[PDB]
Amino acid sequence: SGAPKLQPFTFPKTLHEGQTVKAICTPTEGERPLQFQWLKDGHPLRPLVDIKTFEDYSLLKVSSVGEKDIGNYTCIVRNHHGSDQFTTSLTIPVA
Amino acid sequence: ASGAPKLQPFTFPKTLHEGQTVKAICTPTEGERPLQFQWLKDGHPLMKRPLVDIKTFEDYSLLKVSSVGEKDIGNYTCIVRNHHGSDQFTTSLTIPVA
């Protein structure tokens, strides 16, 4: 008990070029404090991409989404007990 | 209709368990401020409760339901409005059988 478990999240498939898109990384259980780490295609993460982290959730914001942003994004959440993680694909229709 | 708000679609995870925390984010993909956000449950304005918490950011909203119970099962709607238009989504908070 005490280790984090993340709320499942996937990017919607109806996002369109130029829109702002966000991913939320947040536990459904787990002791605090919590550490949040974001990766894109396996590597750590540009003015148009922002990370805002709070006590028990972290928000990745990709503004004016475009070809430069397509890829797989991972959030790893950690506390003193262990970690959880999810990965979700950001793809957009051909405008 | 330039300036009108549009929401990022959001759906609760389909398999929730009693006791967990669950959150819904209501965040705009486009639009001009000022924006106003509201939440409904089963079509009625969402009432404040000790473990039902609406967080207000500068231009988005977050609903946090702690210790999910059968009390919380229902259909939740977020509506965003401004001078130029409105948008909304609805998602069901469900506890399916184990």
Author numbering:
A (entry chain B): 0 to 44, 47 to 96
B (entry chain A): -1 to 96
Provide text from the study.
Recently, a shortened Dscam (sDscam) gene family with tandemly arrayed 5′ cassettes in Chelicerata species has been identified, which encodes ∼50–100 isoforms. Crystal structures and cell aggregation assays demonstrated that both α and β subfamilies of sDscam used Ig1 for the isoform-specific trans recognition in a hand-in-hand manner.
In addition, all these Ig1 homodimers resemble each other well with root mean square deviation (RMSD) values of 1.0–1.6 Å, indicating a shared mechanism of sDscam trans recognition within Chelicerata.
